[PDB]
Design a binder for these strands. Sequence first.
RNA 1: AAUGGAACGUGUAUCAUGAUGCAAGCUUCU
RNA 2: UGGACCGUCGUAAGACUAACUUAAGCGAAAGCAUUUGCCAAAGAUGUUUUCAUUAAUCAAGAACGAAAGUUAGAGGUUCGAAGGCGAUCAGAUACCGCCCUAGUUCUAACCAUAAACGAUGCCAGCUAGCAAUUGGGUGUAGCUACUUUUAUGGCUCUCUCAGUCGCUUCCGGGAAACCAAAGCUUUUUGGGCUCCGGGGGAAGUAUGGUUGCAAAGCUGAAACUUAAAGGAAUUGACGGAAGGGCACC
Lengths: 100, 107, 220, 25, 91, 134
Amino acid sequence: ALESTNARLALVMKSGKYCLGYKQTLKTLRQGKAKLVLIASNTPALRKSEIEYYAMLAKTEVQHYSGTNIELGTACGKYFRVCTLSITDPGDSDIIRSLE
Amino acid sequence: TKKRRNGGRNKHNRGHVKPVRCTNCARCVPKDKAIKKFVIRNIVEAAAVRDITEASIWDSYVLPKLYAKLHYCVSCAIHSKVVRNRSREARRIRTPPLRSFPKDMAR
Amino acid sequence: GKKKVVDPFSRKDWYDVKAPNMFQTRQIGKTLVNRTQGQRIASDYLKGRVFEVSLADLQKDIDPERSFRKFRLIAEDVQDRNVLCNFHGMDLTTDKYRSMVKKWQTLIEAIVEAKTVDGYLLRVFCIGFTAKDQQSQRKTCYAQQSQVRKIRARMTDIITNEVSGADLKQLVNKLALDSIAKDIEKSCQRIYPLHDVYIRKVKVLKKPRFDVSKLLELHG
Amino acid sequence: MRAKWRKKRMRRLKRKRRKMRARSK
Amino acid sequence: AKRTKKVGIVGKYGTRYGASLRKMVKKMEITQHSKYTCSFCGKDSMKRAVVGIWSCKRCKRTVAGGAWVYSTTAAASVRSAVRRLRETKEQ
Amino acid sequence: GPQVRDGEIVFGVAHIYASFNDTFVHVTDLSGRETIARVTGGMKVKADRDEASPYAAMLAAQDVAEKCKTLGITALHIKLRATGGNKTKTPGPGAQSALRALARSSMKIGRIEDVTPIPSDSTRRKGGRRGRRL
RNA sequence: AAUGGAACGUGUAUCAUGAUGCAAGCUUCU
RNA sequence: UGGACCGUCGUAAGACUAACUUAAGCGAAAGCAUUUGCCAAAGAUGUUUUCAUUAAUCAAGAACGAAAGUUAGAGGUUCGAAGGCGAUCAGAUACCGCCCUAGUUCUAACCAUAAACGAUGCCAGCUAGCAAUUGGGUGUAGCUACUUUUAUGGCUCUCUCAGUCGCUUCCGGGAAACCAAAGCUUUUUGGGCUCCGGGGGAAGUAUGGUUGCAAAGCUGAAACUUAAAGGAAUUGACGGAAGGGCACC
């Protein structure tokens, strides 16, 4: 199937607030600012499971990406290879409570 | 001159339709351009039906029939006299005509 | 350098072949197997073989409504002039299929592959024929194919349930009365008026194990 | 003699001619 | 400048070794030395180290591949086929 | 579950393959593979063009039926087979004559089936596109 | 350096705690 | 040479979707008929949405472009150019019968051509009845499917667009055959725009340029030849094209 998230991530970029990348995403995961964490399918094995476990202890929901880094980053519209996302305040979203 | 308004047979808005190989020449002709005739016959053919029914145990039976829809090239058909050289007037004329019913389908 | 006598007909024994339980006539025959040599296993040369006879004839439906529906048997086990013969398959006569299928109608085909309670994994081919409404001025009656796709979706939904309802025994029983065809008919007609429906062909090919104990249930 | 086979004679003759010209190049 | 329209990379081999062979070279020497998308870092930093071995410059995940191409045509089909047979045996 | 009583009507399978140029009446084991007396129309007449003839086919069916009847096959179910294919698909002329002659030898009939295996779609029928003239 | 045959518990299939044959006994992104 | 051929059963390989399948659909066109999933596209309808002339058609240039032929693999079952065979026939080299190669198929590349044809440029309006036919929509107090009946769906019935055509008539055109477009082409005129022809052959050849790996393809003369050439319908003659009759040549 999916579609799905390309439409969703554009809305979050426009209205809301973002931190991308392991160091910021971990910081937002720690601080509790991270309502949602999205992890690439690619992420080096360790960091997939770290970011899941920071999330599990945080009780924050992890969305597992269907695509690459370039796919993550093009969705955010940034020319950069994004290997993690935290969506910290999305203002139009039904996206806050979603699992791919 | 275009004698035939349909060109060959009824190709309008498709122009190219997958071909079926003609059961007499094994040729190649698109499916719009086949003369097709429906071969409906009994397996036990005519005289033998009297002989088989007596010999065969069953109370009446009621014979299975053979179906073989044969596909003719134009060349094939007219040799075997399936289509007989019609009309400048009568090529245009569709209709049929049998009179009797029970369709030919010999040899 | 073999060289056998001649008249090998006067060297090929005699044997009885038994049909299945829930049909009607559990004799379908006697036939002439190779004489048991210690240099020939005649029992193995009875086992691998597969037969087809139309169920109509065996059922002995005098005016046969069942005339078309072809039924396959496989000769499982050899015991003192008796051969059992389980379900192997059910096809359909070419006569029926071809005669019905006359231009002026959409044709539908559906697929299921599903597993019985015993490990026979059997594939059924449901074939839909479509019906002109009473006083249909429209000579050709064609489906919009949202219809055909949806019928295909319903066809597969109905047949999957039916397969897994107890083994080949219960499955073939659903075929016999054609309750599958009726369940197809009530469901399909909501979408689109339909004519002739049958289970067309079924091929079993996974056949789990020889499982002789449950096999001998069939043996009357 | 039909246009196709006449066209083939000229096509065949063109390869003959091309070969001749190719010698002298 | 698009210096050479026709030859590109095969201009190293210049005049030697006949034009038809040189066309074959052009495809292969493009596919090798080319940065491929690493499935395991999502970055296009995978380059051909040696004949059958592609190392991703970042994450250092080194993947076994086709000699000129990361994915040989046989491989894609191969991997899908085994995967599909896996599903039917299990359930 | 209606037992089994011994004693006839005990069927075999006739397996008639009636094609153009030769017609076979191969009577076999009901299960299929173990046979009695294949006997073609071919050995019934030496004309090369009459191997298919319903004259030949009648005689073949009669010859086989004796071999079956003496050894205790009283009866036979029947399978009829074209050439079915990228081949003619039409049953050979000896077909009806074999069928009725097998019955008229005190052999009891219960099944006439057309097993003729019909292509759902198959490559190129012989004669390659400028097709088999004459 | 763990072969073959069986022994604890399991369960499906067959029949009313026991028997019967086939499965199981053992750590799977990372 | 006895186990072909054949039957039966399984299996291997490659190919392909008969019937169903059409005056039926789609796609710009070539072309596109098994099932199912995904990705994105197109079109008709519908829209009191938006934009507010953006548009129409086109040298050049480009996109796609059946098949053969060609480069390299996979693939080669089937059919099967060439070859070699049996008859036929003066010849067969062919039709015909056998074996079968390149080829068919698929993939990465070529080629740019075909009756690539519906022989008919595209976009707009207008000019005739009927019934089909593809799709949507308006009404269905119509039939059927169901839940207590419904609500829903499909088909007919009614009405309407836009599609592809047919039939019979033109109510025009045409030389006619035909053509609802080949009409409105005027009375030497009609919306807008392209392309092509201006006697027949030579000749799609020569020549040069171009493209192509090559085969080829595009662009494309003339010398010179010649009074006809083409299309149509009509009547005869003639058929190893088709149906009736009539006679003991």
